[PDB]
Amino acid sequence: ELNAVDAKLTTDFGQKIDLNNSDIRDFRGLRGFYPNLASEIIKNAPYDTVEEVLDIPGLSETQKSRLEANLGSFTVTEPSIELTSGDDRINPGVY
Amino acid sequence: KLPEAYQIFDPLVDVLPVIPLFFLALAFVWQAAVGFK
Amino acid sequence: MESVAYILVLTMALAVLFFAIAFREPPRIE
Amino acid sequence: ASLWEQFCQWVTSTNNRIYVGWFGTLMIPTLLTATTCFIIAFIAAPPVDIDGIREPVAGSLLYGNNIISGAVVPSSNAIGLHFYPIWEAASLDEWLYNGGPYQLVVFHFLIGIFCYMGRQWELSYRLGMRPWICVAYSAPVSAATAVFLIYPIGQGSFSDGMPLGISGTFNFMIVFQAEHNILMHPFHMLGVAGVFGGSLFSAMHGSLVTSSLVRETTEVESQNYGYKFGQEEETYNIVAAHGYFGRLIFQYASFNNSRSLHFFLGAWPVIGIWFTAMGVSTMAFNLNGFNFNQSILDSQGRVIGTWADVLNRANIGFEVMHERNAHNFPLDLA
Amino acid sequence: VELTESTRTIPLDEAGGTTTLTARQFTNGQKIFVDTCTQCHLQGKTKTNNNVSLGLADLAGAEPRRDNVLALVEFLKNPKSYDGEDDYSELHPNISRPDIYPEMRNYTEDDIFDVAGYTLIAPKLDERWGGTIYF
Amino acid sequence: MLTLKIAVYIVVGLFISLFIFGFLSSDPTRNPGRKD
Amino acid sequence: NLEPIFQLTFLGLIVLAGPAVVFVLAFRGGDL
Amino acid sequence: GGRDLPSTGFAWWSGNARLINLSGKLLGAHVAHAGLIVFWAGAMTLFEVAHFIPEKPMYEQGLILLPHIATLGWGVGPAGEVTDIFPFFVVGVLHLISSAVLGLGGIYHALRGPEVLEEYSSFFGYDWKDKNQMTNIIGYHLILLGCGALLLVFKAMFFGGVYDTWAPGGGDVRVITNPTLNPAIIFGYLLKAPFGGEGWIISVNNMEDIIGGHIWIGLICISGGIWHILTKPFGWARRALIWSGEAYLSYSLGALSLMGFIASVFVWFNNTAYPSEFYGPTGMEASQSQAFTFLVRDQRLGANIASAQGPTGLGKYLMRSPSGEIIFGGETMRFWDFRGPWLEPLRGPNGLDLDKLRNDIQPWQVRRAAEYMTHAPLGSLNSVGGVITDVNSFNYVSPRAWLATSHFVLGFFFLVGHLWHAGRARAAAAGFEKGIDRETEPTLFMPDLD
Amino acid sequence: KSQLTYDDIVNTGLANVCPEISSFTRGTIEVEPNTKYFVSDFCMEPQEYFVKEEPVNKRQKAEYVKGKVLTRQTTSLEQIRGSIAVGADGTLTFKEKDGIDFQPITVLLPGGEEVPFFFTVKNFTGTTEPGFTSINSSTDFVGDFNVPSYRGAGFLDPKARGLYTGYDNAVALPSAADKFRTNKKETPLGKGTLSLQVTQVDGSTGEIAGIFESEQPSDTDLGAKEPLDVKVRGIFYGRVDTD
Ligand code: CLA
Ligand code: CLA
Ligand code: CLA
Ligand code: CLA
Ligand SMILES: CC1=C(/C=C/C(C)=C/C=C/C(C)=C/C=C/C=C(C)/C=C/C=C(C)/C=C/C2=C(C)CCCC2(C)C)C(C)(C)CCC1
Ligand SMILES: CC1=C(/C=C/C(C)=C/C=C/C(C)=C/C=C/C=C(C)/C=C/C=C(C)/C=C/C2=C(C)CCCC2(C)C)C(C)(C)CCC1
Ligand SMILES: CCCCCCCCCCCCO[C@@H]1O[C@H](CO)[C@@H](O[C@H]2O[C@H](CO)[C@@H](O)[C@H](O)[C@H]2O)[C@H](O)[C@H]1O
Ligand SMILES: CCCCCCCCCCCCO[C@@H]1O[C@H](CO)[C@@H](O[C@H]2O[C@H](CO)[C@@H](O)[C@H](O)[C@H]2O)[C@H](O)[C@H]1O
Ligand code: OEX
Ligand SMILES: [Ca+2]
Ligand SMILES: [Ca+2]
Ligand SMILES: [Cl-]
Ligand SMILES: [Cl-]
Ligand SMILES: [Fe+2]
8 A cells, every 4th residue: 555655656646846846856857946946946835726826925026937848747635744854855855 | 386496306205105114124134234143 | 593593602601700710720830 | 119110010910810911901992992892892882884975874773784694894985093982972872873883993902912912921021931922923913903094094085994704804804805806916925825735734743743652641641641741751652753744745854842842833824814904005005916908918918817817707706796885986986 | 999089079058059078178177176176066066055056957047057167167167056046156156256165266268178078078977976975 | 979979079089199109109119030 | 298208217217326336345354 | 222133132123122222212212213203204294295186175185194284273264265375385394494403313323423411411312210310301392282281372362363173253263352261161061971962181172271281281291390390209109100211201101192192082072272263073973864855845835833743752852861951863963062163053051952953043054064964974995985785986985084093003002002001011120021930939939719 | 930031040940931921910901892912921830641541441531641751840831922802792712823832741640650641732723702892801812822833853763764764664674674664653733622721811911821832732752652641730821912
């Protein structure tokens, strides 16, 4: 029986960048995201929908444009504390 | 590096520190010449 | 209860040591 | 005459069944303390949080270990190099949980073995002997000191001392190889030469003496009864042994001087063990074995593997798994 | 094989530009890399922050892409964050700050060009380049 | 704990003092050869 | 270049020096 | 004296033992050997100068003597930047020339000078059993040693100062105006436990303590020198000690073994007398630096490093020492006693201070931590830097590693030599160093054990 | 810790002690009806630990048992930042924000069972009764706080099993690998209740000290076993920014 993270890998989380669960290393593929925009996104999680990532308070016009450009790569799943607790979205012990 | 006036003896200073090893070896040379009395 | 077996063998070795020292065959010059 | 003089004559007396001596006046208490604490802990010590991550490791027989897996677990990484006697614990249970028994046993044992070496000198002096048996014993003492004190000092924690157990010893060695490549350290190669050669020379010497025993018994009784304790005459024919050995290899490679032979027998393993003890003591400061990883490149620049690269792969396999929960940051510097 | 001209041929700029290091340019780039970069760039990694390695994928993912020699030289003059937003001239060695990075003050533009070329060539000689710290 | 610390300190001090004063008690004389 | 050449010149001269002293003393009858 | 086995009783491989009673020849051997030491000092200094790239750190270039000169305040400025390369050259040149002079004298005494000095002069002639003369030589050399300590003091105070890595405004060469002569501090250093967090004398952490302790050492040595010139050993010392040349050698061997061990520990742990500017970071420093580097990086990424718990449940970045102090997390928990000039500004009374960590970290501290983390004293014997599983492209072994390993090895072998010579001196004084006498074999007159 | 330096504090255990205000202190901190005030350096120092033992009989009183800490003076929350808001009616709401707001603690109980638990004040929101126009000796902040799993999802058990890392089966027993319930690791977010009885208010400097009692579950070892109930009694201190 999958524990809970593998069950997340069954979902869209295991297919693309989850705005509520992906680690900040997972944003490096998106040009212009890591680290500033990626950290801003992780700080302002959770998001009910992918679209409210454009409603991050204090967001910037170039950041707005980049988020609109890469909306396709994003998904939103229920924020699992397995992936979130301990600031593991910032440093999950991977170097 | 060495001050500019001295860099023609740069390949000599390269070998200076190893001399006391040669002194230790020379002890054995001297004892071998005397037949290790 | 395998702890008992381990303790048993260790104690056997130690007792052998004490007897081999205290009750050794004396070396005698003859 | 005086009470103190009488005590001095008793302690330094050569008629005691076990020589005590002044070094013995320290050896006996410390060694007994270490032995009693070691036995008690090995049987019944509760689990110890060696890595300082609240991950206690069961070392004692009563907590599920056998003789092979049992150990006295090194003190916690949180302690580091701090002195942790019993009286600095809030309770005995805290002292046990943080690995205090390891520090107690190890410190007393080290004092005891240094005093054992001094006691060897002392008895040699009282008996009118030459004084250098203790010099030979200084090799095992150096090795034990390297693994119990010097390596923890250089690494900065008694948690990185050798555990007092069989499997703990193996764990120590595997991690040591992963971190220092001790196999590729020339001082460990000299230690291996020391012990392999010491066993070789022990086998040759014993076999050559046994081979050249003078006939003094019958075919029934043990040939050992041909020797009488304290006999003046020689019990084997060293000239026949020399003839055999100098024909086995060639004449001038064979000792015919028993004194030179026995000096060689003493010196070879002792020197080898000194070198390997210094190897561990200097790897304590992370001056490691040879690193030939990617030393051979082809003309384009692609790495050509050697056996050193395969060895490095094994080292990495050990390295990434050891103390799996203890590391937070990418480099294993501590 | 030899260290062929194709092996030494690397993208020169973002517009499809292409340059070929000479064997001497490559060897001096290697020497400079070993002298001053391998400190925290051994095998194309980044010891102090391995989210941003010297691997070709990391280099190409930067903003702008750094998998060409001009972008590499520009970074070595004016280092920036991976998304090109934060000025790292206080935090990464560069020839523009000889006062805090003296280990770099003796390097010419030719030297920086050579080390950038080597940074682009080394990945195709080592599959482990830019990987995990223990890898 | 303090009682233990004091007791250990006394025991260790006594054994060390024994060792020191013993080796100060003309130890070179205690041998089967020359006593000068 | 020439750095190894000069280095080996100094090294060889130094190396010969000690044996030269021992040889000269031995041949000329000096105390050894 | 004889120069072969029949006339001396010593084989060639113990030939220096033939010198035990030839005071002039022994003096020549000592003076020539001192020439060897000074020669190495000068030649190694010139080699290091020649192989010195003055804009690269000293510890990156395998230098062990230049850091000693830099620490004394010669040729360096703030943060250890090498201002003038000439003083290093001068130290080396002077040692080389003086070594020539010493070697000339040692050769003269060893080869042509008087064999023994006792019938030549009472002042220089000595007998090993002459207790007063031996204490006279002790006294002269104690006076000299105290003078050398006072030379260090004079350099630190009146001749431009010494390098102070703890200087405010940045580590710099500064003149020590107020050495601590307070004997409480100076001699309480000697009473500190040699364990973690106390660091018996290795923990001296400010040049005021170093200079004041050297003033005390100079005074102690000079007064002891006078005391030994003007007295003879007392009865208790006479009854406790072996009085022979080999015995004195063994005593010095024990002392040297102790000092070698102390120096190895000292260079491994102390970053005051061995500033990391010249010797690189200590292992403790590098571990703490890595923890700091990733605290800084992850905090910039947005991690709340005060509340982030690691996988085991302990704080990933911060945690408590067993005494409660706030310390870096991870394996570096063992190194929480570390103190360094780059890290103390972020330390509060309780340990690491959250406010300072969140808003007081300077870019120079980040640079310093990255440098120290990447120059951790880990390296292979063939000088491949980093952890042993790293590949061959980083040529670095810390000078601290070289010095600590070498001097632990030398300390050990000098302990061995002390054991050898102490045992031999005892046996020879009692007269059985040549073996058991068959006629009077002591064990034959002893009762049987059981 | 009084007003010393780290040199005076190191290796003493004072670093694990929350500061105390004074003795001649019976002040009150006036608050506006609907403004919020920052809490500067909030400290909690536990002193008593109780674990609710589970009887095997049934249906019978469980009787909290006093434990003793095996971990050393590593048990205190400090440098915590928070806020106190005054509701419309007069409610006082204490909200924890961040700081060193957790400590893993292991307590030994009579019988030999060692109980690790994640002592924390994380995300604690607590409230008083309405009609509080001041912070005084009667202020009781009773509320809830979150208790994360003691072991994180990156933890590996002695068989290298974990949640987002490690094996999902007992690899040492190839033919019985998937048989063990502990093959599935879990990190439930447990819940705690806390009360913060303010007993001492020095309104001039804004420092408040008092007593606390907290109720929370213990370590489950990634869901290996059922959590025990742990009760912590201690003291607390913090500065409230009036301006
Ligand atoms: C200041 C220190 C010191 C001094 C003055 C002496 C002096 C003496 N020792 Mg002694 N010793 C010392 C330290 C010292 N020792 C140490 C530290 C040890 C432990 C290893 C010893 C162990 C020792 C033994 C076993 C013996 C002596 C003996 C002697 C006497 C004659 C020795 C001789 O002729 O040299 C001869 C020199 C040689 C034969 C050359 C030896 C070369 C060594 C083994 C290797 C050198 C390695 C070195 C690091 C360089 C590496 C080279 C590398 C590049 C290959 C002499 C009075 C003899 C004695 O007891 O006399 C009565 C004797 O039997 N010593
Ligand atoms: C530091 C090392 C050292 C020193 C200072 C000495 C010193 C001495 N040894 Mg000795 N020895 C050593 C190491 C050393 N040894 C080692 C390693 C071994 C084992 C091989 C020995 C084995 C040994 C034996 C068997 C004997 C000695 C003896 C002696 C003494 C007489 C010297 C002599 O007549 O020979 C003469 C040698 C020569 C005349 C050859 C030339 C020597 C000169 C000094 C060479 C200098 C060259 C230098 C580069 C030139 C610069 C000059 C100037 C411009 C600076 C002397 C004081 C003898 C003794 O005890 O006397 C009673 C003795 O019998 N030694
Ligand atoms: C510790 C080292 C040392 C010691 C104890 C001796 C001892 C001795 N030497 Mg020797 N010498 C040495 C080193 C040493 N020397 C060196 C390095 C050289 C090379 C220059 C010489 C060259 C030498 C020669 C050619 C002769 C001696 C002679 C003598 C003997 C007579 C001394 C005398 O009365 O003359 C007088 C002493 C003085 C007038 C005192 C002068 C003190 C010095 C020179 C001034 C500097 C003092 C300085 C500030 C103090 C610290 C030194 C500094 C480096 C720290 C005597 C046993 C003579 C002998 O054997 O008689 C047959 C002899 O002919 N020595
Ligand atoms: C290298 C320097 C040096 C040397 C070789 C000597 C040598 C000697 N001194 Mg000494 N002394 C010196 C420096 C030196 N001194 C200085 C600088 C001073 C001024 C403070 C003195 C003041 C002094 C006095 C007052 C006396 C001596 C005496 C002696 C003689 C016998 C003492 C003894 O057995 O030692 C060994 C010491 C003991 C056997 C006592 C035991 C000490 C403790 C118990 C050992 C524990 C050490 C510990 C393990 C190390 C930890 C380090 C630190 C924490 C303490 C001896 C020949 C005696 C003498 O006969 O005078 C003519 C004597 O009465 N000296
Ligand atoms: C006794 C004896 C011995 C010993 C001997 C010895 C120990 C010695 C020595 C000696 C010595 C100890 C020496 C020396 C020397 C020195 C010199 C000779 C020098 C010089 C100089 C110079 C020439 C310099 C130059 C320079 C300059 C000026 C600067 C720049 C650089 C240069 C370098 C160029 C033996 C063992 C063999 C054996 C026999 C007996
Ligand atoms: C500078 C300095 C300092 C100072 C220091 C000092 C001041 C010191 C000292 C010291 C000392 C002051 C010491 C000592 C020592 C001692 C010893 C080392 C001893 C001993 C002993 C012995 C050896 C004995 C022996 C014996 C016995 C056991 C008995 C019998 C007899 C005999 C003799 C055998 C300080 C740190 C502050 C700072 C830094 C720097
Ligand atoms: C490539 C060919 C093989 C190369 C071999 C190299 C090794 C050869 C031996 C190395 C030198 C050994 O040196 C040897 O020492 C012995 C000790 O017994 C001494 O032997 C000799 O001593 C003296 C020489 O002065 C003679 O009077 C004496 O009769 C003779 O025994 C000599 O000094 C030398 O013969
Ligand atoms: C024969 C040789 C000579 C033997 C003589 C030596 C006798 C033993 C002396 C040991 C002295 C006791 O040492 C004393 O330990 C107490 C323990 O309460 C320390 O006390 C300090 O730390 C303890 C923790 O351990 C705190 O609880 C205490 O409030 C604080 O004052 C003192 O700082 C120290 O002075
Ligand atoms: O503790 Mn036992 O081994 Ca010495 O390296 Mn870091 O510390 Mn842990 O990690 Mn790998
Ligand atoms: Ca050169
Ligand atoms: Ca560098
Ligand atoms: Cl492990
Ligand atoms: Cl870590
Ligand atoms: Fe035998």
